Amino acid sequence: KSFVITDPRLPDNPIIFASDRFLELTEYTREEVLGNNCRFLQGRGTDRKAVQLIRDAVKEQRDVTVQVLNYTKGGRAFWNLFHLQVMRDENGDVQYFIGVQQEM
Numbered sequence: 001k002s003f004v005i006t007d008p009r010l011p012d013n014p015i016i017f018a019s020d021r022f023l024e025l026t027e028y029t030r031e032e033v034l035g036n037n038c039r040f041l042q043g044r045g046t047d048r049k050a051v052q053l054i055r056d057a058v059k060e061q062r063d064v065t066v067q068v069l070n071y072t073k074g075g076r077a078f079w080n081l082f083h084l085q086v087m088r089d090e091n092g093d094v095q096y097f098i099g100v101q102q103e104m
C-alpha cells in the first residue's frame, strides 16, 4: 500500500521513509519528500478544519482517520483517505508515526 514513516524526534517531524506506491500516487521523487514534513501536499482547496484534526491527533499522539484534499506534484487534486497510527515502539514513548494514504 501507499504509506510513509515519520520521525517525531526530529525537528518538524520529517518523513524518513516513503513506500513506492506513495511516490507514484503523489508524482514526487524520493529525494524531494525525504526530510520534509508531509504538509507540502496541501493546497488552496484543502479544508483547514480537517488539517486541524490531524494536528490534534499528532500532538495528543492518537490514532485518526481523516479524509483530506491533496495535490500531486503536477497540480491534480485528489481525495486522500488518510489513516494515522502511533509506533509506541518503546515502552510508553512514541518512536514513529505511520501514515497510510489512499486515493479515494
Ligand SMILES: *[C@@]12=NC3=[C]C([C])=C([C])[C]=C3N([C][C]([O])[C]([O])[C]([O])[C]OP([O])([O])=O)C1=NC(=O)[N]C2=O
Residues within 6 Å of the ligand: 004, 005, 006, 037, 038, 039, 040, 041, 042, 051, 054, 055, 058, 068, 070, 080, 082, 097, 098, 099, 101
Ligand atoms: C500527510 N501524511 C502524513 C503522514 C504522517 C505519518 C503524519 C504524522 C502526518 C501526515 N500529514 C499531516 C502533516 O504532516 C501535518 O501533521 C499537518 O499539516 C498539521 O500540522 P501543521 O504543522 O502543518 O499545522 C499529511 N498531511 C497531508 O496533507 N497529506 C499527507 O499525505
